[PDB]
Amino acid sequence: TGLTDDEAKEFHAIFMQSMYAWFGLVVIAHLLAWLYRPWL
Amino acid sequence: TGLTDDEAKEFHAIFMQSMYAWFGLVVIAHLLAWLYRPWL
Amino acid sequence: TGLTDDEAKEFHAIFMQSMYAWFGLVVIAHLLAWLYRPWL
Amino acid sequence: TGLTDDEAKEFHAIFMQSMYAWFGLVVIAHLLAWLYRPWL
Amino acid sequence: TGLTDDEAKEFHAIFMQSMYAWFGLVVIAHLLAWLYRPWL
Amino acid sequence: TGLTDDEAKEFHAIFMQSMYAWFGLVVIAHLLAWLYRPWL
Amino acid sequence: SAGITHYIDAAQITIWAFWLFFFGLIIYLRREDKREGYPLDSDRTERSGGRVKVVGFPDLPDPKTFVLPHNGGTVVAPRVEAPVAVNATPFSPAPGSPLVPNGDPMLSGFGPAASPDRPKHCDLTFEGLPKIVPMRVAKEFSIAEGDPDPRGMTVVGLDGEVAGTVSDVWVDRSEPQIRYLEVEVAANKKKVLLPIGFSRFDKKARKVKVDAIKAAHFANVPTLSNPDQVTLYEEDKVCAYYAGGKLYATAERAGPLL
Amino acid sequence: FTMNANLYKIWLILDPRRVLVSIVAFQIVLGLLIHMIVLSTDLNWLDDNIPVSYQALGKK
Amino acid sequence: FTMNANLYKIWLILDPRRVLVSIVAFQIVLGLLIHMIVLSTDLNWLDDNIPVSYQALGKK
Amino acid sequence: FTMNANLYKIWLILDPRRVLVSIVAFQIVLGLLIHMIVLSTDLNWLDDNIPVSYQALGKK
Amino acid sequence: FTMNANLYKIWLILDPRRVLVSIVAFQIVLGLLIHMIVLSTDLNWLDDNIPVSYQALGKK
Amino acid sequence: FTMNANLYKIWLILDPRRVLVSIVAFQIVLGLLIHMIVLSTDLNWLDDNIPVSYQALGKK
Amino acid sequence: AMLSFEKKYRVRGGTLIGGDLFDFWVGPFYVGFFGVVGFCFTLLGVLLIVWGATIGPTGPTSDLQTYNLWRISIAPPDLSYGLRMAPLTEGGLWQIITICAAGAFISWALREVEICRKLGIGFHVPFAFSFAIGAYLVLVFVRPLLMGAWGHGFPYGILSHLDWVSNVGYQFLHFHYNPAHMLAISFFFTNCLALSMHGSLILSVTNPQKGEPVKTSEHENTFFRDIVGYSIGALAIHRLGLFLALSAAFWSAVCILISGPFWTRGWPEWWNWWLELPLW
Amino acid sequence: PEYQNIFTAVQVRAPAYPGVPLPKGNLPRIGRPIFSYWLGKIGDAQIGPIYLGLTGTLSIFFGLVAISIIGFNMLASVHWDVFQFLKHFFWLGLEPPPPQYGLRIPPLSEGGWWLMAGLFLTLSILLWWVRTYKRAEALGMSQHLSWAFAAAIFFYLVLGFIRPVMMGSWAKAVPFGIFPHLDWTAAFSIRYGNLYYNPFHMLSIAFLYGSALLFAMHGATILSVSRFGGDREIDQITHRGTAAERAALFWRWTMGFNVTMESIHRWAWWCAVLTVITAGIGILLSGTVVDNWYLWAVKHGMAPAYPEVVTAVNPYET
Numbered sequence A, B, C, D, E, F: 001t002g003l004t005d006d007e008a009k010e011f012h013a014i015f016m017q018s019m020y021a022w023f024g025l026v027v028i029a030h031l032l033a034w035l036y037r038p039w040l
Numbered sequence G: 001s002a003g004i005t006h007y008i009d010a011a012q013i014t015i016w017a018f019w020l021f022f023f024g025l026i027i028y029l030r031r032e033d034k035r036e037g038y039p040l041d042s043d044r045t046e047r048s049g050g051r052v053k054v055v056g057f058p059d060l061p062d063p064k065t066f067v068l069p070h071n072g073g074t075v076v077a078p079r080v081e082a083p084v085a086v087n088a089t090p091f092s093p094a095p096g097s098p099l100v101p102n103g104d105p106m107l108s109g110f111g112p113a114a115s116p117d118r119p120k121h122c123d124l125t126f127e128g129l130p131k132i133v134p135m136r137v138a139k140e141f142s143i144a145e146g147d148p149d150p151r152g153m154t155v156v157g158l159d160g161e162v163a164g165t166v167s168d169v170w171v172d173r174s175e176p177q178i179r180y181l182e183v184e185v186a187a188n189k190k191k192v193l194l195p196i197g198f199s200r201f202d203k204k205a206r207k208v209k210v211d212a213i214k215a216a217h218f219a220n221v222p223t224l225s226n227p228d229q230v231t232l233y234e235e236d237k238v239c240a241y242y243a244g245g246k247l248y249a250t251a252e253r254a255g256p257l258l
Numbered sequence H, I, J, K, L: 001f002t003m004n005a006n007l008y009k010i011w012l013i014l015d016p017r018r019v020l021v022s023i024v025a026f027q028i029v030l031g032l033l034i035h036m037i038v039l040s041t042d043l044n045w046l047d048d049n050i051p052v053s054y055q056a057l058g059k060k
Numbered sequence M: 001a002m003l004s005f006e007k008k009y010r011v012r013g014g015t016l017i018g019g020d021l022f023d024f025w026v027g028p029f030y031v032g033f034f035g036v037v038g039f040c041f042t043l044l045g046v047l048l049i050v051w052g053a054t055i056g057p058t059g060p061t062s063d064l065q066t067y068n069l070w071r072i073s074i075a076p077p078d079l080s081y082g083l084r085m086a087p088l089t090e091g092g093l094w095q096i097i098t099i100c101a102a103g104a105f106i107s108w109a110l111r112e113v114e115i116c117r118k119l120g121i122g123f124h125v126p127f128a129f130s131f132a133i134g135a136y137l138v139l140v141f142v143r144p145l146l147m148g149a150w151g152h153g154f155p156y157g158i159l160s161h162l163d164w165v166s167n168v169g170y171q172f173l174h175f176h177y178n179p180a181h182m183l184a185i186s187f188f189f190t191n192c193l194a195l196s197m198h199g200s201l202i203l204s205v206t207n208p209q210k211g212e213p214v215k216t217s218e219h220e221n222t223f224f225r226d227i228v229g230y231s232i233g234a235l236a237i238h239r240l241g242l243f244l245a246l247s248a249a250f251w252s253a254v255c256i257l258i259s260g261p262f263w264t265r266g267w268p269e270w271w272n273w274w275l276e277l278p279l280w
Numbered sequence N: 001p002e003y004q005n006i007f008t009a010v011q012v013r014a015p016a017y018p019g020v021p022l023p024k025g026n027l028p029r030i031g032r033p034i035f036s037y038w039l040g041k042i043g044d045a046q047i048g049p050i051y052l053g054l055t056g057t058l059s060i061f062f063g064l065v066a067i068s069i070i071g072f073n074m075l076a077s078v079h080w081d082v083f084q085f086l087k088h089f090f091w092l093g094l095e096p097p098p099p100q101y102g103l104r105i106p107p108l109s110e111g112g113w114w115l116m117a118g119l120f121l122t123l124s125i126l127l128w129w130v131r132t133y134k135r136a137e138a139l140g141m142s143q144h145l146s147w148a149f150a151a152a153i154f155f156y157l158v159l160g161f162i163r164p165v166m167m168g169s170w171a172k173a174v175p176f177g178i179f180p181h182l183d184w185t186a187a188f189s190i191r192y193g194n195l196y197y198n199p200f201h202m203l204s205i206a207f208l209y210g211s212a213l214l215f216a217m218h219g220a221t222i223l224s225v226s227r228f229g230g231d232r233e234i235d236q237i238t239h240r241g242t243a244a245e246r247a248a249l250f251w252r253w254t255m256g257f258n259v260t261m262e263s264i265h266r267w268a269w270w271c272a273v274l275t276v277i278t279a280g281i282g283i284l285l286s287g288t289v290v291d292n293w294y295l296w297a298v299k300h301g302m303a304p305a306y307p308e309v310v311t312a313v314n315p316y317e318t
């Protein structure tokens, strides 16, 4: 898969952090949206 | 399928845990869904 | 189908038990279904 | 049919009992059906 | 991508502030637009 | 690609002022336009 | 005011969007169109000594590389191709004038007889064995039940004279089909290829007509630098000769008619 | 699970990877099919107002 | 142990990569699907006016 | 166990470049889709005329 | 400004030229789209008679 | 301390001839475009009847 | 100007008519005797379409006169003129323009013919072209003839001819039921499928994933055989596509040829022969 | 006289070819080949083998389900009289949920079968999509097919799923029947004010005519250079031959410019993909954005005026 065993820990390290960051942006926007106009 | 018996136990185990985590999220969603909005 | 007589005992064995487990799950779903909302 | 003369005997044996089993399950389901819901 | 490990710090460094600059210009024009003509 | 670093500093310099001149002529036109015919 | 009809509706602006994407598309396809044959040939380029390379609008796209399978190479487009003399002389020195072929028209290798220099290597099967080979090299191949076997029919030119007889049949190992007919020439018993595209059958007679060249011309069919395979170069050289007969093989295909 | 014959031999006759794929596919189809048929019949369990009405709990 | 005591062996027969990615696609589509299903029934949550009709608030 | 512990190994299995870009595409499309979904329902936020209407904002 | 720090390594995976042009196209398009979106809604700023009607600078 | 300070290097990556010609073209098109867009709306400057009506060389 | 490999083929001769008289090139276009005739037919035709746009149906000052590209239209004469030449300003113009268009297309075809003769290639293109020329003729010559008047031809205008198609089609109530129409539509569609499939294949093999080499004939066949259990093969797909497109034009020509002259009733009614067989 | 390369006049056989090998994961191939002397008369005589994976089997499955609901329903509509079914088949069909139902899942007897056949058909089509991408990857090739199929799927989805949902009514999707679906097309144009003045449908019509023009031209060309092995477009693309040269030149001398053996396939590709892509756009706007195309065209001054020689007074106005 053209990666080494250390660069799938490393890549993964970066991915996990980036995704959790993004999801952070998401839960943020959705809470704001729930504030202005709750949908449930 | 180019795997050895150790990389199918390794895979099976990790898979099982991942699949169960996802399913966990599922019952999570189903409980939130059921409390505010019972369907049965 | 390129199998020897012994991997037709093993495959048949694992197959059989898995299918019976599945039939179990089905009988389960049908019983829950039969209790809550009879169709017969 | 790439089989031997004895291996159309064995197949036939196994086939026959398996088939009588299916037609039987069928006669059962058909009686089950006929008592509860006559159509004739 | 035929880059050295040092020359994507470089590309990243310049890219990021430029991108952010764009986001700035955007937030500005959006504020200007919001003042002149709110949409929510 | 295929310029020395000095001729893309140069090119960037000349480009930048030239583009800014265009931005100038445009801002000119937009102000006259706002004067003869307010749109906002 | 709940009725200010807007004059611009989604259909207008979407037809606008279309036309813009369209223009970019057209341009792009015209750029791929110049991956061969370009820059053009004018006396504008030669008059200027070359400072006027002819390319038009749009311009030429950066080369693209094709990586041939099997140690084959790397091809590029657009590329720089070495000029090649013309085996003909201007019918007029005036521009836009055609050229008359030099010498015996079929030999000229000009006009319907012209052709480029394709590789002097062979097209290959997936495996990498010469794709086009004769049935003698391709042991496995076989005529289709109910089809006259070409092997043994008589090849006859445009004026009804025998040329030779079919000594074998060349086939595609990639897409099973008759690609070439082999011709044991009568006049010198030398072996030549005859493209299927130039050959007509006369099954009840076991003949293989050729309106293309005359029986005699079969004597000059370009030859193979090896009788059990053929190169790309050789395929062009073979077909183009026959093609020449379409305008040269008679002192009349030259046209007019009136 | 009570003995039947030599009905294991089926796998000397029928390829296991393929029967697996056959069952997975067939069952998936049947599942969606019946689910929708029921969703399309009176035994509907969604569009019933169960157990609390949702279309006249907010258009209100 | 009365249970698929050798059910790793499935990944000796069925390609793990394909099966995984296939699994992901399958769930994403089913999610899309069922969501669409719910949207078509009484259980719909959007064209509902929840918690207040917006197509009848505004000044004006 | 909720905890993965060897799920770095997934990039030993799935091309990182492709999975990445895949996510980029899937997210941007989904964003576009649901945005449109919201725009078509009660929860719409553009044609609301809130807090003051612009289309009947002039006597002229 | 990553914000920290080895997320430069991202240009070790995805071509800088391609990523750049991709963003350029994507934005150059998106801008037009929303421009259009705005043109059909309350935020329309042209065929509004704002601040004075121009096809009422004469007759037509 | 920021970083917008090596933003000349852009001409080491994107062909200047192309970026230029691209921009020249893009602008001529955008110009014709916007002109037509305004021309189809109220802000029109052709069919306004301003300042001396030409179809009024008589009683019009 | 010439392609970078063109001079070696620019041979002299091959005409049908003219010989060295017009046997020369102009830029990239080949002239030849039929190009000169063609250019004459074409130019006068277009220039006349220009005069028709200039005059309009009621005169140059009328509101119906127009230079708007969508609405300019030159329509045939009324039926009262039958097969006679009608006055210029009463559909005559349309007749002449038609003569010019037909002549230009037939010239064009013959010029492709001289061009095939020059290059030593097959005459498949101008033969194929001749199907469109045939289609055009039924739509302006054959049909209106069988119908005792040239006025049955369609007008030459961007949307007016669309209106023509529309009302002639609707005279038969539900044209979709025309069986030749159903055929022709199927061929136009199938043509569109093969074209999209061939396109896709060639571009999918000559340009594969980075890291892979130009694909092969074996790939080509293996793919469509993988998906749909068959591959008609490279040559033949070029053969099929030509079949589909030429047939699509054919059945369009026959589908309209039968609408009037050989069938006057509504079209769905045609299918009656099927509901009335003595099987039901 | 000269062979036209219309009919293989003499064919040849070799043991069938199971094809290039797929990597691990792409399951075996099934079925064992046969040759049809007649297909052979016009094309590769080999019939199969075929590949069938999870995807492919799950698609064959959904697709046949959908075909069964449509068919069974048609037999039901003539009362199971298979004779009558045979008699009116062209006119038989499975109509969509009635409007009274909107987008709700309707009862079996009122359209629910259509929604199930629509459901399963679409799923089976998009599964055939995935199938063709898998089948296209195992060979290292590119996704050109898949981008076109994705365009045609786009139009399909626009017809029976996207527009109906947007319009809030399954009754707006197209019904399954030959003549019935012909009627849906005509009624469709009538309802929305003559689809001829709908620009997108004009372009799609230009692109359909164009797929016919391009395939006719290119095909005629390639056969005309089939004497130079011009059909072997792959190597004429890598190692340009006098076939690709005579080919590009025929067009050059006729209409003044030309393309190349590789690029003509890009013109063709894009033109086909364009039909379906203008077409879907055309349906997208019908009812959602424009309701009367004839009117739309009048608003944009494209509709012609003819001397009003025949006219009728409007009774609604008396």
Ligand code: BCL
Residues within 6 Å of the ligand: C022, C025, C026, C027, C029, C030, C033, H023, H024, H027, H028, H029, H030, H031, H032, H038, H045, I034
């Ligand atoms: C109409 C009356 C009841 C109903 C009665 C039943 C009955 C009865 C059954 C189900 C079953 C299923 N139902 Mg239900 N079900 C109802 C309402 C719902 C709703 C909903 C939104 O309202 C949903 C999402 C589901 C969803 C499901 C699936 C998760 C499940 C398996 C079948 C399947 O996937 O098909 C296609 C896929 C397969 C057939 C799988 C084939 C593959 C192998 C053999 C099995 C492994 C699959 C998977 C790992 C098993 C997951 C479920 C396990 C039980 C945890 N049901 C209605 C209310 N449902 C079945 C079940 O529970 O499993 C036994 C079943 O027998």
Ligand code: BCL
Residues within 6 Å of the ligand: A018, A022, A025, A026, A027, A029, A030, A033, J023, J024, J027, J028, J029, J030, J031, J032, J038, J043, J044, J045, K002, K007, K010, K034
């Ligand atoms: C009633 C509903 C609310 C609504 C509620 C929400 C909610 C809730 C959300 C959004 C979110 C989004 N909304 Mg909103 N939104 C509404 C009104 C609008 C309007 C408008 C015209 O009025 C607009 C333009 C938007 C626009 C946006 C999008 C910009 C954004 C989702 C991006 C996306 O799809 O993922 C694609 C984007 C990416 C994948 C990231 C781009 C990363 C770039 C390309 C990479 C930079 C390089 C990087 C440094 C290194 C490489 C990293 C790897 C590439 C990853 N909203 C209405 C008012 N909106 C979502 C959000 O906040 O963001 C998640 C969200 O959760």
Ligand code: BCL
Residues within 6 Å of the ligand: E023, E026, E027, E030, E033, E034, E039, E040, K027, K028, K030, K031, K032, K034, K035, K038, K043
């Ligand atoms: C002003 C009237 C129109 C408007 C008209 C335009 C026009 C015209 C353009 C854009 C463009 C952009 N718009 Mg907008 N845009 C508006 C509504 C929104 C909303 C929203 C939540 O409502 C969002 C998120 C956006 C987002 C953006 C970006 C997606 C984009 C430019 C930068 C970019 O892509 O990077 C991402 C950028 C961001 C993530 C920053 C978000 C932008 C600002 C800060 C968001 C404004 C809303 C925000 C919630 C603050 C509102 C103020 C408070 C209510 C007081 N717009 C309103 C509806 N928008 C430009 C474009 O697309 O091409 C590049 C462009 O030409």
Ligand code: BCL
Residues within 6 Å of the ligand: F022, F025, F026, F027, F029, F030, F033, L023, L024, L025, L027, L028, L029, L030, L031, L032, L038, L045
């Ligand atoms: C809508 C209300 C006003 C209006 C308001 C504006 C506003 C506001 C603007 C214009 C502008 C433009 N208007 Mg105006 N305009 C009106 C009516 C008109 C009418 C008319 C028939 O009535 C015309 C012909 C024009 C014409 C034009 C263009 C000349 C010009 C934009 C140039 C461009 O886009 O090209 C593309 C431009 C470029 C590529 C940059 C310009 C450079 C030129 C083209 C040279 C290219 C370089 C080339 C390689 C040559 C090399 C140079 C040598 C080295 C020296 N306007 C209406 C009445 N108009 C714009 C402007 O700047 O001009 C004042 C502008 O901002």
Ligand code: BCL
Residues within 6 Å of the ligand: M105, M132, M133, M134, M135, M136, M137, M139, M165, M166, M167, M168, M169, M170, M174, M175, M176, M181, M184, M185, M188, M249, M251, M252, M253, M255, M256, N185, N186
């Ligand atoms: C309006 C009501 C009826 C209708 C009535 C008609 C009628 C009436 C007709 C058609 C026609 C046809 N219809 Mg219909 N049609 C209907 C519905 C449909 C539907 C659909 C989706 O429902 C479809 C796909 C079609 C499609 C078809 C085609 C099968 C066919 C036209 C092919 C053609 O012209 O080739 C022929 C191609 C040509 C004639 C062009 C020839 C080219 C010439 C030689 C060169 C021209 C050169 C020129 C100068 C180029 C200019 C270039 C510039 C100089 C640069 N119709 C509706 C239901 N339809 C026509 C037909 O049947 O076939 C003729 C016809 O007369």
Ligand code: BCL
Residues within 6 Å of the ligand: M165, M189, N067, N121, N125, N152, N153, N155, N156, N159, N185, N186, N188, N189, N190, N195, N196, N200, N201, N204, N205, N206, N208, N275, N276, N278, N279, N280, N281, N282, N283
């Ligand atoms: C009848 C009255 C109107 C008319 C109304 C319409 C309407 C309404 C439509 C068209 C449509 C089209 N019309 Mg029209 N059309 C008319 C007159 C014409 C004339 C003519 C000469 O006058 C022509 C040439 C055309 C030509 C065309 C085509 C260009 C265009 C779409 C083609 C296509 O293939 O999409 C068809 C291709 C597909 C749908 C994709 C197929 C892919 C699917 C997934 C295949 C699945 C196969 C299946 C799974 C296999 C199992 C089988 C099961 C049994 C199902 N029309 C008249 C004026 N026309 C379309 C359009 O333009 O909309 C703007 C359309 O929907």
Ligand SMILES: CC[C@H]1c2cc3[nH]c4c(c3C)C(=O)[C@H](C(=O)OC)c4c3nc(cc4[nH]c(cc(n2)[C@@H]1C)c(C(C)=O)c4C)[C@@H](C)[C@@H]3CCC(=O)OC/C=C(\C)CCC[C@H](C)CCC[C@H](C)CCCC(C)C
Residues within 6 Å of the ligand: M038, M041, M042, M043, M044, M045, M046, M049, M097, M098, M100, M101, M102, M104, M105, M108, M109, M112, M125, M126, M127, M128, M129, M130, M131, M132, M133, M155, M156, M157, M158, M161, M245, M246, M249, N209, N210, N212, N213, N216, N217, N220, N254, N255
């Ligand atoms: C028969 C199968 C398909 C086909 C085949 C086909 N067409 C062909 C060819 C072939 C093989 C060519 O080789 C030839 C060509 O040169 O390739 C572009 C051609 C051709 N296909 C063209 C058009 C064309 N083909 C069409 C269709 C078809 N042609 C079928 C789909 C269509 C349509 C209606 O769908 C059109 C529009 C031309 C570009 C070209 C022939 C052009 C030509 O011969 O030029 C000479 C004539 C002129 C330059 C114009 C003469 C001026 C006239 C006096 C005025 C015209 C009046 C006209 C009657 C009015 C119409 C007004 C419209 C607004 C309605």
Ligand SMILES: CC[C@H]1c2cc3[nH]c4c(c3C)C(=O)[C@H](C(=O)OC)c4c3nc(cc4[nH]c(cc(n2)[C@@H]1C)c(C(C)=O)c4C)[C@@H](C)[C@@H]3CCC(=O)OC/C=C(\C)CCC[C@H](C)CCC[C@H](C)CCCC(C)C
Residues within 6 Å of the ligand: M189, M190, M192, M193, M196, M197, M227, M228, N059, N060, N061, N062, N063, N064, N124, N125, N126, N128, N129, N132, N145, N146, N148, N149, N150, N151, N152, N272, N273, N274, N275, N276
């Ligand atoms: C530019 C767009 C054009 C186009 C392109 C296009 N079409 C395409 C594609 C592309 C790119 C594909 O990739 C795909 C294809 O596969 O090409 C061959 C396809 C496709 N286009 C097709 C049809 C089609 N496309 C059309 C249109 C168009 N497609 C446009 C012209 C049309 C029209 C409107 O005329 C049609 C009718 C199909 C051949 C194919 C999609 C097939 C599909 O989705 O399959 C779904 C499932 C089934 C059909 C079920 C299979 C039924 C089997 C025949 C039964 C076999 C039974 C078997 C013996 C097993 C036993 C049964 C067991 C249950 C017991």
Ligand SMILES: COC1=C(OC)C(=O)C(C/C=C(\C)CC/C=C(\C)CC/C=C(\C)CC/C=C(\C)CC/C=C(\C)CC/C=C(\C)CC/C=C(\C)CCC=C(C)C)=C(C)C1=O
Residues within 6 Å of the ligand: M190, M193, M194, M197, M198, M199, M201, M202, M220, M221, M224, M230, M231, M232, M233, M234, M235, M237, M239, M240, M242, M243, M246, M247, M250, N006
């Ligand atoms: C790179 O090369 C390629 C390959 O090679 C490897 C491929 O294999 C492939 C795969 C290709 C395929 C699988 C081909 C697929 C073709 C499809 C799906 C088309 C569908 C066609 C059918 C179902 C058959 C329809 C036709 C019939 C039943 C015949 C009916 C006969 C009728 C109506 C009467 C005939 C008479 C007429 C039509 C009247 C007059 C007609 C003419 C004058 C036409 C003249 C024709 C010629 C050819 C000169 C591709 C795409 C490719 O590009």
Ligand SMILES: COC(C)(C)C/C=C/C(C)=C/C=C/C(C)=C/C=C/C(C)=C/C=C\C=C(C)\C=C\C=C(C)\C=C\C=C(C)\C=C\CC(C)(C)OC
Residues within 6 Å of the ligand: I033, I036, I037, I038, I040, N067, N068, N070, N071, N072, N075, N105, N115, N117, N118, N119, N120, N122, N123, N156, N157, N159, N160, N161, N173, N174, N175, N176, N177, N178, N181
């Ligand atoms: C006796 O017969 C036996 C053999 C049983 C079987 C015979 C079968 C036969 C002969 C069948 C014949 C069928 C024919 C001829 C069918 C022809 C159909 C035609 C011509 C159709 C034309 C157009 C149809 C279209 C475009 C359909 C579009 C439908 C769509 C796009 C439906 C989409 C629905 C979806 C995606 C469903 C969503 C469900 C959700 C999830 C939303 O539900 C909540």
Ligand SMILES: [Ba+2]
Residues within 6 Å of the ligand: H054, H055, H056, I042, I043, I044, I045, I048
């Ligand atoms: Ba609700």
Ligand SMILES: [Ba+2]
Residues within 6 Å of the ligand: I054, I055, J042, J043, J044, J045, J046, J047, J048
């Ligand atoms: Ba609202």
Ligand SMILES: [Ba+2]
Residues within 6 Å of the ligand: J054, J055, J057, K042, K043, K044, K045, K048
């Ligand atoms: Ba406003």
Ligand SMILES: [Ba+2]
Residues within 6 Å of the ligand: K054, K055, K056, K057, L042, L043, L044, L045, L047, L048
């Ligand atoms: Ba005005």
Ligand SMILES: [Ba+2]
Residues within 6 Å of the ligand: M276, M277, M278, M280
């Ligand atoms: Ba009777």
Ligand SMILES: [Fe+3]
Residues within 6 Å of the ligand: M198, M202, M238, N218, N222, N233
């Ligand atoms: Fe081709």
